[PDB]
Amino acid sequence: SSSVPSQKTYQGSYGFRLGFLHSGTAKSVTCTYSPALNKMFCQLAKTCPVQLWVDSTPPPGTRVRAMAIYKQSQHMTEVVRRCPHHERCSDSDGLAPPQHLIRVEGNLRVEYLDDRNTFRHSVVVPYEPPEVGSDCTTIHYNYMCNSSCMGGMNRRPILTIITLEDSSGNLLGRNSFEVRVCACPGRDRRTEEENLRKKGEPHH
Ligand SMILES: [Zn+2]
């Protein structure tokens, strides 16, 4: 890609990554992410638990921002906006505006990006040192827009990139994952893993 920046995960000097709690589905689960494909399956507006793990010392005041992009190369130049019905349905919820489908829980000093010259959409969160018992930064992400939203994604998946850097602007730990909401996380993971397993059969 020459137009938009690269989407390569860092996990370098800090070997920091995003950990999503997974659990085998029996018929219908909440959060189901495929490790092999690094894809996440959730329900519309369902809580998406994300864990920020690191290996080296991260700045006492590191800023970790998460942005949603159009991984769909066929529409990578198609930025996702807020639907007119989604903006008219609700106005205020938890400090997050309808314009942004991404939401953060347990926020302290977060800021929503929206440059008037670039019109970029991304949320930034302040560093919160690990707690005796976790050793990782637990951030809860909520998406108020599923791929089903013909007036939003239009059957186009989106990839979220969580970057952790200093105020000076130095990426220390930044990775990206795929988010798929369709009120069927266990059905998407079981159907994607079960359908992808066979990979064709008849043909002619
Ligand atoms: Zn929508």
From Swiss-Prot:
Effect ascribed to mutating I102T: In sporadic cancers; somatic mutation
N6-lactoyllysine: residues bearing it: K27, K46
Reported effect, P129T: In sporadic cancers; somatic mutation
Result, substituting L52V: In sporadic cancers; somatic mutation
Outcome of swapping T77A: In sporadic cancers; somatic mutation
Record note on what altering P130S does: In a sporadic cancer; somatic mutation
Effect on the protein of changing R189H: In a sporadic cancer; somatic mutation
Effect annotated for changing E192G: In sporadic cancers; somatic mutation
Protein name: Cellular tumor antigen p53
